[PDB]
Amino acid sequence: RIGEVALQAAKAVGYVGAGTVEFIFDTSTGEFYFMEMNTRLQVEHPVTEEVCRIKGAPLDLVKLQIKTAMGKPLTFSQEDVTLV
Amino acid sequence: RIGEVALQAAKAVGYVGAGTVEFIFDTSTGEFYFMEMNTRLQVEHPVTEEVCRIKGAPLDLVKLQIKTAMGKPLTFSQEDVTLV
Numbered sequence A, B: 001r002i003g004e005v006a007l008q009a010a011k012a013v014g015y016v017g018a019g020t021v022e023f024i025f026d027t028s029t030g031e032f033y034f035m036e037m038n039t040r041l042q043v044e045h046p047v048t049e050e051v052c053r054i055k056g057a058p059l060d061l062v063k064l065q066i067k068t069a070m071g072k073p074l075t076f077s078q079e080d081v082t083l084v
Helices: A002-013 A045-049 A061-070 B002-013 B045-049 B061-070
Strands: A020-025 A032-038 B020-025 B032-038
Touching (some): A002 A020, B045 B061
16 A cells, blocks of 8 residues: 555656655554655665565666666566565 | 567557557568558457467456456566467
8 A cells, every 4th residue: 555655646746767755654543644755766775675576586776767767668567576 | 570560550540459460471572561450359369369478377368458448557568478
């Protein structure tokens, strides 16, 4: 679900490339509320990489951003990506 | 290459669903020239199916057409499909 909310916001403003949506969460309430988003690659990009593989292959975040600039379209759905 | 030519024509007119582009070819010339296209599912659909697999799974042409009508987007690039 975190994804469905995040994709709605990025589509609404229109977005190309890589980015990060930030939330704020309370355990007692159990719900997440939007706080801020950054339209820029974070410093924490290589961290999230260790917990995601696409089509069984290692993921490179910067690679795609160059390929995104290339104009080529993607090759994978949200599905091909799995955490490990 | 047959693909690159076919995709150009379908994009130019705009197209949704399944279709077939027909060519005419001379061995002596070695080049293919456009003759006609049909904007309709052929009768020969199950034939081409035996020579194409997507993500290693059996392909169902009619299935996708319902899923295309569903509004869901695809899950595979031109690559995932291989002949066998």
